[model samples]
Target chain A: TSLPSAILNNMVTATLILDDGLAIRYANPAAELLFSQSAKRIVEQSLSQLIQHASLDLALLTQPLQSGQSITDSDVTFVVDGRPLMLEVTVSPITWQRQLMLLVEMRKI
Target chain B: TSLPSAILNNMVTATLILDDGLAIRYANPAAELLFSQSAKRIVEQSLSQLIQHASLDLALLTQPLQSGQSITDSDVTFVVDGRPLMLEVTVSPITWQRQLMLLVEMRKI
Candidate 1:
């Protein structure tokens, strides 16, 4: 499925791909380090389990899935490893096997 | 406040900073080259004037303004210079003078 291949693998930015339902489908190594866990452990987990934030909007994250609308926001605050991490979040839509998926990338600032 | 100063200045990626109302606020030099116009001209213009597409959704663009949501889409088809452009679009939210603004960046694919 090219899960850990191509640009996703090479990106220094942490990437987490989510299903239509916003479940974690895949997390790259950078994401693993950001979450302080391995991909095998974090895969299939909801984003809420990883990021603790009050301003995190799931509807905005998944908006691209149904409407093919893309979203990017900087100054997004997240608590990773119990510390506030200021990151730029980009949620992009992609087609896989005729199914829509959201590709989420988090670039730390 | 620092337009065309930091990342926007040196990025090989084309960047366009938009206002909450979807007007083009600032465009980097690369963006000028992409649109084949200077920032002086592109600023304060609507997105529709530049990209001709029936499917372009402005709601997705303003969603970030109210909800602080971000957006990104790849393999987006664009028509610039009368040529079709397949680009990756990233729209980020930022703050300037205590006002919400969106930063848009594009990379040719």
Candidate 2:
């Protein structure tokens, strides 16, 4: 792995890479731990499938991709496997593999 | 640059890599723009030299390194070039070139 990737893989914060479709492309170990799954299983899963949020406007999550900015939302409740987890989420635009992607960072509140 | 580094270089948020001593080892373009200095000039400068925070305990910044965790500080007022900028800062431990480093991300508030 590259230096940045190596660093990211070791970070305690749950980090993920998502495509414009809101499908997860990558999940670090911390993220895998958070979801109680391995990276292989987490990849390609839509955010909605991984986290239960019926009222969340999925389109709003793509704002960072369009504006090339970072957006932070606090006290977001994500229900995973019937367990509700309160988290702070930050989504930032990034280019990966020659395509635009969103870097999502999540921290427990 | 590797894929992750390329992504970081294009990120809108200011990102920096600091050594254990808190000296900047690398600064992305956004970070350079934030400090109004080039990467060449920003490298090797201590965090204290770049921002004015007399009362801030610098040792606290290294806790992430010791604990292998990520730390975030909100509404941090940094005096840079006589201007006070309120920012949300996140410090994460990372491994670079076999050495432990800190990945600092700052966003304007």
Candidate 3:
């Protein structure tokens, strides 16, 4: 649980954490601007609704429901304001405080 | 064409290159092993056939074909031999010596 990754406010990567039932728990500063909304708004949203693309939604829904399952970065494209951006999402199942965690490898282009 | 990205021989990342035709052209050392085959063997394989997930295919086909477009790390999960692997693929169109180029950011879990 203490793998200890920190995100500076200016860092470009977006890190958002949701609980076992997929409620927003924690979101980094970069996550705010990346979602093109305020951090408060993003925290109020679901991961599925925040993204502009549905392919990523589908991938998140279908994969990583099992233990020992991890996905690195596959093509999940989101078109933001008509600009195409690629993403690398890595999902891992982690346990902390008796809660299931999803770790993602998110990159922006 | 000389943006010159290099890949180390052994690491956890997978690197593969494809020509404009979407045919395998080059693969780095880690890529061969990660693909569970020799470098030469992987060079003979198509990107589509090696992956068991179709979500990535959908993303790749719909996004990135337009000019001046790039995607970061989104979710594309591949299930290989009953194990799920994550990948981040970034594709861009480039003209090198009058040939097309596609760049990928491949990650494995």
Candidate 4:
């Protein structure tokens, strides 16, 4: 079965799903608030453009895709809407419809 | 459709699925490594018994089930085989067969 639409539409926490190459597939409402980008604008963009921060190591972002494990970074800083927000980020690899997808979640600190 | 078995079976990170009540429904091989228990023994057990650490708040575990969002915790410590291991934990709410389920992933740091 597909993901529950209700869960995403009504959830208060920000959530994003990405393809293997990090192209955004889905961004929920809460995500729109955090990233300052509507689902329509960010859906096809890659993580490279979505999250911009000096502390983030781009190579580390591939851990999930390469190892099929979840990876978390603390005190993560990302730029959106010209403002920087501090948060913790976690990326998990999941399989949907037999294709590889990444589940990215960020919790504001 | 159900979750892909291969994703969990071969995943390098520890993964678990739980019912709304937080009862373990599934665990993968990597999970066995982190928990020091076989999937057979851990299935149907509660997260309370599986994760034991002073920094963890049992109340926080209920967030995902109630909010339908993915939540991540940093510097999480849990006991496995009587040894303490520090890791990061993430919980995401998902639906399987129209029933609410929680997907959990832990990454050792």
Q: What C-alpha lDDT values do all the predictions have?
A: 0.65, 0.76, 0.54, 0.71
**Top-lDDT structure, candidate number:** 2
Model 2 agreement with the true structure over A1-109: per-residue lDDT tens digits? 5766764566456778889888998787879989898899989999888987533335438778888877777657789978887876778887876789888877666
Candidate 2: segments with Cα more than 4 A from true spot = A54-59, A65-70, B10-13, B54-59, B65-71
lDDT of 1 by residue, A1-109 (tens): 2211422332345767677777887776668888889888899988778777635555557577666666766667888657888776767675655667677766655
Q: Over 4 Å off in model 1, which ranges?
A: A1-6, A57-59, B1-109
User: What's the lDDT of the predicted structure labeled candidate 2?
Assistant: 0.76
Model 1: residue B67 alpha-carbon error in angstroms: 42
Model 3 chain B is weakest, by summed lDDT over 10 consecutive residues, at B1-10
The Cα error of candidate 3 at residue B69, in Å, is 1.2
Going through the candidates in the order shown, the clash numbers are 7, 0, 16, 1
True contacts kept of each: 0.00, 0.45, 0.00, 0.07
What's the distance in Å from true for residue A92, model 3?
Answer: 22
Best by DockQ: 2
**CA shift at A72, candidate 1, in angstroms?**
0.8
Model 2 residue A103 lDDT? 84
lDDT of 4 by residue, B12-105 (tens): 4577778877789877787887788888999999877887644664544787778765777767788755778887777777677778788776
Q: What TM-score would each prediction reach against the true structure?
A: 0.47, 0.76, 0.43, 0.56
Tens-digit per-residue lDDT, A3-83, candidate 3: 012112322445665655666655656567666777777775666576545446554643655644655555778666455
Positional deviation of residue A108's Cα in model 4 after best superposition, in angstroms: 4.0
Candidate 2's TM-score reads 0.76
| Candidate 1 residue lDDT tens string, B16-109 | 7677777787677768988888888888888778877623445447666777666666557778657788876766566655667776767665
